DNA sequence: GCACAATTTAACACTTTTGTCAAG
């Protein structure tokens, strides 16, 4: 369940607070619907209360989960196919998937490769867009704007952030 | 869309020609 003021995630919307629940008229009878808003978008969202766990509606990590993610961010890697197709495809799916542990785990190998040989014009967006959801997630949990939030990664990276 | 061989270009170290000056 999600109360009015719960801090949640709605892929790929990064983070947003739930405003409440309402009966939206969809087709036939109106099932209950959760409401996820994003002030840094001015968008809007309606999430069915039936199976919230099927839309990948997770919740912002707690301040306790910062170090673990950082540790899997600095070191943790993972092999990927050589031809750009499968590799970038996988990375993309992982991105839209909305999984901070997987996005960070990915960011690790992507980082190891970026300063070695160097990152293709594709995997670059697959890195940037990856660090984006992270930097904002940190801003949701620790309530510190993308300035400070991005200032976090600098430690477990070795370099600053864009 | 990308790794890369192919070929072009700007890069530059340096040699030789050509305009030039004070003095016969």
A80 HSE (CA, 13 A, CB side): 22
Contact A63, A141 (CB under 8 A): yes
Q: Taking every pair of C-alpha atoms in chain A, what is the biggest distance, in angstroms?
A: 57
CB-CB neighbours of A23 under 10 Å: 10
Footprint of strand B on the protein (CB under 7 A): A 84, 120-122
Structure tokens at A81: 């196919």
Distance A77 CA to B7 C1' (A): 40
Cα–Cα nearest to A57, from A65, A69, A49, A66 = A49
Instruction: Say which residue the tokens 């801003």 belong to.
Output: A139
Cα–Cα nearest to A21, from A1, A41, A42, A38 = A1
A27 HSE (CA, 13 A, CB side): 2
- The reported resolution of this PDB entry, expressed in Å, is 4.0
Query: What does the angle CA A87 – CA A72 – CA A59 come to, to the nearest 5 degrees?
Result: 90
CA–CA dist A139, A55 (Å, integer): 22
Contact A47, A33 (CB under 8 A): yes
Distance A83 CA to B6 C1' (A): 24
- Measured CA to C1', what is the nucleotide nearest A120? B2
Nucleotides on strand B with an atom closer than 7 A to protein CB? Answer: 1-3
């Amino acid at each position: 369940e999600f109360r009015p003021g719960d801090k949640v995630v709605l892929p790929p919307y990064g983070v947003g607070v739930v405003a409440g629940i309402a009966q939206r008229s969809v087709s036939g009878v109106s099932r209950a619907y959760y409401q996820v808003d994003f002030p840094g978008s001015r968008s809007k969202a309606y999430v069915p209360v039936e199976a919230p766990h099927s839309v990948g509606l997770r919740k912002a990590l707690a301040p306790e989960e910062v170090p673990v993610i950082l540790d899997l961010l600095k070191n943790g890697r993972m092999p990927l196919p050589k031809q750009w197709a499968a590799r970038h495809r996988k990375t993309s799916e992982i991105l839209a998937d909305g999984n901070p542990y997987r996005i960070a785990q990915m960011a690790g190998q992507l980082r190891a490769w970026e300063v070695e040989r160097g990152l293709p014009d594709l995997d670059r967006q697959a890195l940037r867009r990856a660090i984006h959801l992270l930097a904002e997630e940190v801003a949701q949990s620790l309530e510190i704007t993308v300035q400070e939030a991005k200032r976090l990664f600098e430690e477990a990276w070795g370099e600053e952030l864009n």
